[PDB]
Amino acid sequence: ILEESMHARDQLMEQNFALDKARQEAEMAVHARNDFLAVMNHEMRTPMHAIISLSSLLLETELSPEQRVMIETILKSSNLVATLISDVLDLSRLED
């Protein structure tokens, strides 16, 4: 009955190989996705920085109360979005 044993081994051994391969593949797929995520992060944040800069400058110019209030909203929003893009960068770095 080492036919049970020797066969149980063969059975575990390929079972293990499958599990390990399946895990490594998931890992590499997550890493590839994280790489692109991180590579695109500058192109996401930079326009937001421009919007923050331009909004801030606009607040220095002659605005009506309605324009000013709208532009203050653009600015707080843009700042929020920039923070979140930074949290996205952090995510992409988690498995590092």
Added chain:
Amino acid sequence: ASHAAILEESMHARDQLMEQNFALDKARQEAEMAVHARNDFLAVMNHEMRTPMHAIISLSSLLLETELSPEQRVMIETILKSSNLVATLISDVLDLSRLE
């Protein structure tokens, strides 16, 4: 070479494999959970960014209907184009970054 020793040798190998199997299977369950949690975070980020981008797009568009100096209009048109570009980039890249 005892009958016991021979068995010991085979059962041992079997037990070493079984232990590794348990470890590999635990690590699989963990990796599935980490993949799902990462997908959820990307979905949530996308959702959280969508509202303020739409605000920026919408307010810059409304602003362009009001009375602006030429310099102000160029700055606000640049805001609108930039915000359109980025809203789409963020959504596309977060989508592509999920693992299904």
